[PDB]
Design a binder for this molecule. Structure first.
Ligand SMILES: CCCCCCCCCCCCCCCCCC(=O)OC[C@H](COP(=O)([O-])OCC(O)COP(=O)([O-])OC[C@@H](COC(=O)CCCCCCCCCCCCCCCCC)OC(=O)CCCCCCCCCCCCCCCCC)OC(=O)CCCCCCCCCCCCCCCCC
Ligand SMILES: CCCCCCCCCCCCCCCCCC(=O)OC[C@H](COP(=O)([O-])OCC(O)COP(=O)([O-])OC[C@@H](COC(=O)CCCCCCCCCCCCCCCCC)OC(=O)CCCCCCCCCCCCCCCCC)OC(=O)CCCCCCCCCCCCCCCCC
Ligand SMILES: CCCCCCCCCCCCCCCCCC(=O)OC[C@H](COP(=O)([O-])OCC(O)COP(=O)([O-])OC[C@@H](COC(=O)CCCCCCCCCCCCCCCCC)OC(=O)CCCCCCCCCCCCCCCCC)OC(=O)CCCCCCCCCCCCCCCCC
Ligand SMILES: CCCCCCCCCCCCCCCCCC(=O)OC[C@H](COP(=O)([O-])OCC(O)COP(=O)([O-])OC[C@@H](COC(=O)CCCCCCCCCCCCCCCCC)OC(=O)CCCCCCCCCCCCCCCCC)OC(=O)CCCCCCCCCCCCCCCCC
Ligand SMILES: CCCCCCCCCCCCCCCCCC(=O)OC[C@H](COP(=O)([O-])OCC[N+](C)(C)C)OC(=O)CCCCCCCCCCCCCCCCC
Ligand code: HEC
Ligand code: HEM
Ligand code: HEM
Ligand SMILES: COc1cc2[nH]c(C)c(-c3ccc(Oc4ccc(OC(F)(F)F)cc4)cc3)c(=O)c2cc1Cl
Ligand SMILES: [Mg+2]
Lengths: 92, 88, 360, 33, 243, 205, 96
């Protein structure tokens, strides 16, 4: 046993092979970077720090609101029939 | 400092309707206790055997609280597995 | 002060092989900040009057907007203060950091004692059963010292006057701690930090941006785990009896302090003598302080690398860690002769490991 | 040694050692001897 | 002594991260408190206004409050008087002081139930088991009057008589009543009453923990962005090897 | 510096001139320029090809050395024990080292057939080298191993897409999330400052 | 900081206050070196982490096995033996 043993420890041969693999000049996600660059978001909103900060505050204001609304809908669906507004009280 | 502590991997059961609404006027624990009493029989016998050893002693000492507690704890844990299936 | 800011947080050079074991000093500092912010906010609506203290905390939770958030964040973050400190101290004992960072080690020990005292003061304030009876006991272990008890309370018993003064001390001590953090950093940057391999090296890079982004990543995990526990209650960090009003004539069935005090509370419980148990307390602190002078205790020249990697004899700090865990279990158990026997077994390991760290 | 101003830590070292020798000697005489 | 037994885990709806309280069952448990438990137990921290819009509608809460006689004053002549209750009043207490409570219960004090599920180990599971744990004593244990045997109460000897029995009240929604049903319902009510802010707390946590997690991923990418320039760096001594 | 040395006498850690700990066999050159010839005529172990841990060279140092109660580490080299007035004379015939106090306070350097000024010129520390020096001590050519990857494997070259838009959308997203977190914490602090639910009701009559 | 014989500077321009800590740790590059670094905007920065995952994980886990795991298993076993003797001791004193 080589694992954990100071008298024998060494990488097996299948780990030395993984270190020799090569993917030079390959990029499977390139079609994603092309789409982003074609929107010109960098030229109009991120290259200038004044505009970059406008983008931060504005997008954060709208995103935070949509995030809360969505989570409230999930909450109401999971808990259908258990919340107060779902079971009208009947008087005697 | 919390009303309860949340748990993972809880099985929330489905309600089992009865045949006659008047059936659930009695505690549905009675239907589940016999089956749960047979599965804890290993403790039913240790309790009955400890009573004989105490009934025979001359002095007025000895009890069976230990075996009695283990027996009824086993049964309550068996009932909890399914009791909520019959409760609204 | 901006030249000091850029000299120590921007252009400061650090070894390339740093990792997350060197990020927990920043996390402790951030926990102090969070406690100061939430603490001051709680103080705006807390009442030190014993007859109304317990009620002021409940009314705060039940009636005030967002009152539950500041109360539960303050309680949870306190537990993370002690977990970070424990990991912070253990790194030092694994790498023999006190070999050349001597005054950094000593200053740290003072900060640890200050944090212990602060937490103890804060736990009495909500004024429940565990508040009262835990203070009564822990303040009696100090009885061997003459007249060190009746004055801190200002009465014949943990009365309503003790509560007023524990509030002021609890308010003040954290800011004193912030002063000593400045000394701590002074003594560190005097020598420079070590690294996991224990070697001198010229392969260093600037703090910003490489090392600053590791601290930021760890901060995210801390904030997320605090809020997870605070808002959902996954672990049981507080005792239920403190949700009961004080009763001076009825002792609870099981008295146990917070988890970060349990281990040493167990050590003191398995030693029958009351005077011998307090001497054991001093000897342990004295041992930790003496490590600042480890270079001088033997004429052989020491090395920082301790060779725990792939070593079947382990290391003394690891053996201590498991003895501490073992005692936390004993401390949380009902007294029983069998528990007491094993508790004494572990106490010997708990103490002997400290002493042999001074040998090499 | 000559050339530095670390002058308190050598005093702390001798006080701590002495304190330890006295604690473990007062316990043995109470339990063993 | 010995360690008491751990109670079993019952599948209460609220135990999940994503779940709320079961309000139909909270309503029925409030009838059980009002008609059975309130005769011996106080809930001094609860007020009628706490129920409005969360358990019952406003007009119904007024009718319940007005059925009680509450002390108020002093009047212009410096005297005390009584009047019907209003939304601002607290749940009525059965005894004026603790000494009067013990005198009526053989020296035992029924504790206040405002934080009861936070004040016992295992909380609601313990309360459910307690309420159905009364048994006859074992061989060799004889108890004096005023004490009863219970599986889950520490020491087994409790001074509370069995409070529940089959068929004793008529729910308003038509649910058939039995000992087990009443136990589940009264536990839900008392868990809500221990902290009515539980639903607000959990819904805010979901929004927060999810956001923080996403930001943690982004910061991980930004860290590895700078890690790679020094992890892939080459340093040669003497002469240049590769470009 | 703020660190003092610990050169003092010791009754348990004897002086190195009597117990060296390190393997006490050294060669001696008449002039240190000669070591350049040793470095080109001796073979190096790192130039041979080995494949298994079991074929690695065995050290000439012995594992049995430091002993004692609770002594975890068992091998050391150097110590600061003070040297006495009259130290032991090194035995050069056995390869023993002569340096420091063992040159100044002994007659180890006398040679009957040479002037004293010539003999003692050969006892500077650069004149001694431990056995095994040329065969073993590494002298690396790079920090990088040819068995490991470097930037040649990961570099984006011609034909690659620009990354700037992605890098700054990554950072901007972190910030609009962190800004929302801050805005929420401040709004909750302000609410806490405002009137409570029990007092808002008392005002309605 | 660095030793005195390393802190000695070759130039004469004054040390600016924002750089006080940099020059307190000056170190001479004995023998020299040649450095090559690529811009982070022109590197794959997540794939290298996973390309070397198996080798890094082997190195870390192998180092920790003996020193941490072997004492942990022993502590776990002692915890079980302790709990087995407590139960038997309760029945030898209270059960009939
Ligand atoms: C998809 C389906 C679902 C499944 C998926 C998962 C779903 C869940 C969600 C997703 C989860 C994963 C997400 C991705 C994660 C990505 C990040 C990641 O991998 O993180 C790891 C990563 C590791 O860091 P690294 O830089 O990669 O490597 C550092 C080296 O390891 C440092 O090593 P070094 O060599 O440089 O330094 C030497 C030494 C220096 O020392 C130190 O660094 C400090 C001490 C380290 C040891 C810590 C333990 C001691 C403290 C004990 C505390 C006791 C608590 C008391 C209470 C007890 C109650 C009972 O450190 C060590 O020795 C470290 C090795 C420790 C090994 C421990 C071995 C345990 C063996 C157990 C055996 C058990 C046997 C019995 C079994 C019985 C049953 C059969 O850490 C981080 O990035 C940290 C981020 C979080 C910051 C902390 C904030 C929270 C604070 C609370 C937690 C505290 C602990 C945190 C870890 C600390 C590590 C030092
Ligand atoms: C700045 C830039 C940024 C912008 C501006 C920032 C502006 C703010 C900055 C501040 C501005 C205002 C100025 C502030 C000045 C403050 C004073 C100052 O600087 O002095 C530094 C000064 C160092 O000056 P230096 O120029 O660096 O070097 C002096 C020499 O030339 C050369 O000496 P050396 O190098 O050879 O050795 C020096 C070494 C000398 O080391 C020692 O002598 C040891 C000192 C620590 C001993 C305690 C640690 C634990 C030891 C084990 C337990 C022992 C128990 C006792 C029994 C022992 C055996 C009989 O000192 C250290 O290691 C430094 C430690 C830091 C101490 C700071 C504490 C200040 C006073 C406040 C204390 C509050 C305590 C609260 C927590 C406790 C609450 C219950 O520190 C001292 O020498 C004072 C030591 C005071 C020790 C107090 C210890 C109290 C606790 C004792 C234990 C009690 C346990 C009871 C348990 C009971 C359980 C029921
Ligand atoms: C009527 C009943 C009476 C009962 C009382 C007891 C009566 C006993 C009478 C015995 C009479 C016959 C035997 C006489 C022997 C005399 C030996 C002597 O004086 O030395 C001569 C002679 C002295 O010459 P020297 O030149 O000084 O040589 C010294 C060596 O150089 C040394 O250095 P070295 O380099 O050669 O050795 C390496 C060194 C360094 O090695 C290392 O550092 C390696 C360490 C590796 C550790 C890796 C551990 C990894 C696994 C961890 C597992 C997890 C743990 C953590 C988790 C915990 C969770 C809770 O190794 C050690 O330091 C060994 C450590 C031994 C520790 C044993 C301590 C036992 C204490 C028992 C309790 C005592 C009371 C405590 C207080 C109670 C309250 C007041 O020594 C030798 O030749 C060697 C002999 C060594 C013998 C050791 C074992 C003796 C055992 C005796 C029997 C004990 C029975 C107790 C139970 C009884 C039940 C009824
Ligand atoms: C369990 C929890 C923990 C998380 C899950 C487990 C961890 C792994 C998850 C999978 C993520 C990695 C996927 C593979 C690698 C991708 C990158 C890459 O280079 O791949 C191609 C690369 C080869 O490609 P190449 O051609 O050489 O180079 C192409 C690139 O140019 C090479 O260029 P480059 O190297 O410079 O980098 C390219 C760059 C470019 O990547 C892109 O393609 C850009 C993508 C843009 C989006 C970025 C992700 C943002 C997601 C946020 C969440 C959604 C927000 C939206 C709203 C949601 C509303 C619900 O890559 C990225 O930036 C990576 C983005 C993904 C980050 C990971 C996100 C995971 C969490 C997602 C959900 C959020 C957390 C939950 C909270 C929310 C729900 C409650 O292959 C590899 O790297 C090897 C792949 C094998 C590694 C995967 C191993 C997976 C199994 C181990 C984990 C098992 C579970 C945990 C065990 C431990 C705990 C017990
Ligand atoms: C006055 C300060 C703001 C207060 C009011 C606003 C609310 C505060 C809550 C946060 C709001 C969001 C921040 C504003 C946006 C900033 C954008 C900007 O200009 O940045 C420039 C840039 C923007 O990113 P960039 O670098 O990609 O931009 C390059 C420039 N462009 C894109 C225009 C070509 O950011 C930086 O320079 C980053 C510096 C490193 C900081 C890393 C942050 C992590 C924090 C870790 C440490 C922990 C801190 C806690 C300390 C606690 C102490 C007690
Ligand atoms: C008077 C006839 C009572 C009625 C009606 C109810 N309770 Fe009570 N309770 C009473 C006493 C005298 C005691 C003290 C018991 C003792 O031995 O000290 C109690 C106690 C409780 C407790 C506390 C249990 C504990 O672990 O300490 C609870 C949780 C409790 N009672 C709940 C409860 C409920 C839900 C009731 C309505 C179904 C109820 N009680 C009625 C006296 C009386
Ligand atoms: C490291 C710093 C601090 C720590 C470790 C700490 C710890 C604690 C602890 C453990 C409690 C008891 C919580 C409970 O069980 O209810 C508490 C309560 C309290 N603390 Fe802090 N505290 C710190 C800082 C502060 C500061 C700086 C202040 C005010 C300036 C403060 C004000 C309060 C108040 C008012 C309470 C009572 C409210 C309550 O008990 O919930 N705290 N503190
Ligand atoms: C409020 C409490 C503390 C704070 C805020 C704090 C802060 C820090 C920080 C930021 C660092 C540098 C980064 C790091 O290494 O993590 C550090 C390093 C260090 N700390 Fe702490 N610390 C505290 C307590 C302690 C304690 C209790 C000890 C020891 C008993 C200690 C000893 C050390 C040492 C020795 C180092 C240097 C480690 C090395 O470079 O090898 N500190 N501290
Ligand atoms: C080898 O590695 C270590 C050794 C360590 N040794 C010791 C002695 C401690 C320590 C110090 C002070 C302390 O303060 C006390 C609080 C409360 C008390 O009393 C009571 F009852 F608990 F409240 C007693 C005491 C409690 C514990 C450590 O933290 C520690 C940590 C590591 Cl990593
Ligand atoms: Mg030394």
């Amino acid at each position: 046993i080589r694992f954990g043993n100071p008298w024998r420890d060494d990488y097996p041969e299948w780990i030395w092979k993984s270190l020799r693999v090569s993917r030079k000049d390959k990029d499977m996600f390139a079609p994603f970077f092309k789409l982003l660059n074609a929107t010109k978001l960098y030229e109009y909103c991120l290259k200038d720090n004044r505009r970059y900060c406008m983008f931060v505050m504005g997008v954060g204001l709208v995103s935070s609101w949509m995030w809360s609304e969505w989570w409230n809908s999930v909450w109401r669906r999971i808990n259908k029939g258990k919340l107060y507004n779902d079971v009208p009280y009947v008087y005697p | 400092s919390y009303p309860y502590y949340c748990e993972f991997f809880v099985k929330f059961p489905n309600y089992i309707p009865p045949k006659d609404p008047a059936e659930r006027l009695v505690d549905p624990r009675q239907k589940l206790e016999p089956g749960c009493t047979a599965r804890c029989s290993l403790w039913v016998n240790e309790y009955d055997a400890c009573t004989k050893r105490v009934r025979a002693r001359t002095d007025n000492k000895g009890n069976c609280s230990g075996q009695y507690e283990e027996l009824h704890v086993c049964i309550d844990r068996c009932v909890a597995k399914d009791i909520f299936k019959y409760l609204k | 002060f901006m030249s000091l800011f850029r000299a120590h947080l921007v252009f400061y050079r650090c070894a390339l092989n740093l990792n997350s074991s060197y990020n927990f000093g920043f996390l402790v500092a951030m926990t102090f900040v969070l406690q100061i912010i939430t603490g001051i906010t709680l103080a705006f609506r807390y009442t030190s009057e014993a007859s109304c203290a317990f009620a002021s905390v409940q009314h705060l939770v039940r009636e005030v907007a967002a009152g539950w958030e500041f109360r539960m964040l303050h309680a949870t973050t306190a537990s993370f203060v002690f977990l970070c400190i424990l990991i912070h101290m253990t790194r030092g004992l694994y790498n023999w950091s006190y070999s050349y960072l001597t005054t950094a080690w000593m200053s740290g020990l003072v900060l640890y004692l200050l944090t212990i005292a602060t937490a103890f003061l804060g736990y009495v304030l909500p004024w429940g059963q565990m508040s009262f009876w835990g203070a009564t006991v822990i303040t009696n272990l100090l009885s061997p010292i003459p007249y060190l008890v009746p004055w801190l309370l200002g009465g014949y018993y943990v009365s309503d006057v003790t509560l007023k003064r524990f509030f002021v001390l609890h308010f003040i001590l954290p800011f004193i701690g912030c002063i000593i953090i400045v000394l701590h950093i002074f003594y560190l940057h005097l020598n420079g930090s070590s690294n996991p391999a224990g070697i001198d090296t010229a392969l260093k890079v600037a703090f910003y941006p490489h090392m600053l982004m590791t601290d930021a990543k760890c901060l995210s995990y801390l904030i997320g785990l605090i809020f997870l526990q605070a808002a959902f209650g996954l672990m049981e960090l507080s005792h239920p009896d403190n949700s009961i009003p004080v009763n001076r004539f009825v002792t609870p069935l099981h008295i146990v302090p917070e988890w970060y005090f349990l281990a040493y509370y167990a050590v003191l419980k398995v030693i029958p003598s009351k005077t011998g148990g307090l001497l054991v307390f001093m000897s342990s602190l004295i041992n930790l302080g003496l490590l600042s002078e480890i270079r001088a205790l033997n004429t052989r020249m020491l090395i920082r690398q301790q060779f725990m990697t792939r070593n079947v004899v382990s290391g003394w700090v690891i053996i201590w860690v498991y003895s501490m865990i073992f005692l936390i279990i004993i401390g949380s158990a009902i007294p029983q002769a069998t528990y007491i026997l094993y508790g004494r077994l572990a106490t010997i390991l708990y103490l002997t490991t400290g002493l042999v760290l001074c040998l090499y | 040694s000559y050339g530095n101003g670390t002058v308190l830590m050598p005093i702390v070292r001798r006080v701590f050692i002495g304190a330890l020798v006295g604690i473990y000697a007062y316990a043995a005489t109470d339990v063993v001897l | 002594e010995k360690e008491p037994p751990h109670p079993p885990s019952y599948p209460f709806w609220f135990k999940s991260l994503f779940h709320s309280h079961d309000i139909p069952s909270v309503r029925r448990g409030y009838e059980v408190y009002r008609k059975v438990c309130a005769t011996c137990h106080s809930m001094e921290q609860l007020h009628f206004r706490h129920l409005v819009g969360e358990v019952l509608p406003e007009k119904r809460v007024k009718q319940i409050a007005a059925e009680y006689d509450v002390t108020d004053g002093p009047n212009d002549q410096g005297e005390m008087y009584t009047r019907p209750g209003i939304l601002g009043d607290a749940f009525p207490s059965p005894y004026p002081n603790e000494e009067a409570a013990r005198y009526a219960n053989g020296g035992a004090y029924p504790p206040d139930l405002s934080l009861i599920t936070a004040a016992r180990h295992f909380g609601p599971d313990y309360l459910m088991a307690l309420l159905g744990g009364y048994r006859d004593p074992p061989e060799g244990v004889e108890l004096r009057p005023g004490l009863y045997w219970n599986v889950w109460f520490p020491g087994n000897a409790i001074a509370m008589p069995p409070p529940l029995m089959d068929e004793m009240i008529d729910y308003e929604d038509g649910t058939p009543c039995n000992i087990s049903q009443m136990s589940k319902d009264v536990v839900n009510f008392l868990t809500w009453a221990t902290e009515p802010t539980a639903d607000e707390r959990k819904l805010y946590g979901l929004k927060c923990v999810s956001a923080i997690a996403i930001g943690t991923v982004l910061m991980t990418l930004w860290w590895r962005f700078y890690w790679a320039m020094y992890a892939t760096r080459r340093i040669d001594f003497g002469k240049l090897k590769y470009l | 510096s703020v660190h003092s040395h610990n050169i003092r006498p010791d009754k348990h850690e004897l002086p190195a001139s009597e117990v060296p700990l390190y393997y006490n066999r050294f060669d001696q050159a008449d002039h240190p320029s000669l070591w350049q010839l040793e470095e080109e005529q001796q073979r190096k172990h790192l130039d041979q090809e080995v494949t298994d841990v079991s074929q690695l060279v065995e050290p000439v140092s012995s594992p049995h050395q430091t002993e004692g109660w609770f002594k975890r580490l068992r091998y050391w080299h150097y110590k600061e024990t003070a040297e006495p007035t009259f130290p032991r004379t090194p035995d050069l015939s056995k390869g023993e080292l002569a340096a420091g106090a063992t040159v100044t306070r002994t007659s180890v350097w006398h040679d009957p057939n040479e002037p004293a000024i010539v003999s003692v010129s050969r006892f500077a520390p650069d004149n001694f080298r431990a056995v095994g020096f040329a065969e073993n001590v590494p002298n690396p050519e790079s920090t990088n191993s040819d068995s490991h990857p470097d930037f040649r494997e990961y570099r984006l070259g011609p034909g690659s897409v620009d990354r700037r838009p992605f890098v700054y959308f990554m950072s901007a997203s972190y910030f609009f999330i962190t800004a929302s977190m801050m805005r929420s914490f401040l709004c909750k602090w302000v609410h806490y400052w405002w009137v409570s639910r029990d007092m808002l009701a008392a005002g309605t009559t | 900081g660095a030793p005195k014989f390393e802190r000695k500077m070759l130039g004469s321009y004054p040390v600016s206050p924002e750089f006080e800590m940099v020059w307190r740790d000056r170190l001479t590059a004995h023998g020299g070196y040649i450095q090559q670094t690529i811009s982070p905007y022109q590197l794959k920065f997540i794939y290298p982490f996973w390309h070397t995952f198996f080798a890094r994980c082997w190195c870390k886990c192998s180092a920790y096995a003996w020193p941490w795991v072997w004492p942990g298993l022993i502590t776990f076993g002692l915890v079980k033996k302790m709990n087995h003797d407590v139960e038997e001791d309760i029945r030898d004193h209270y059960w009939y």
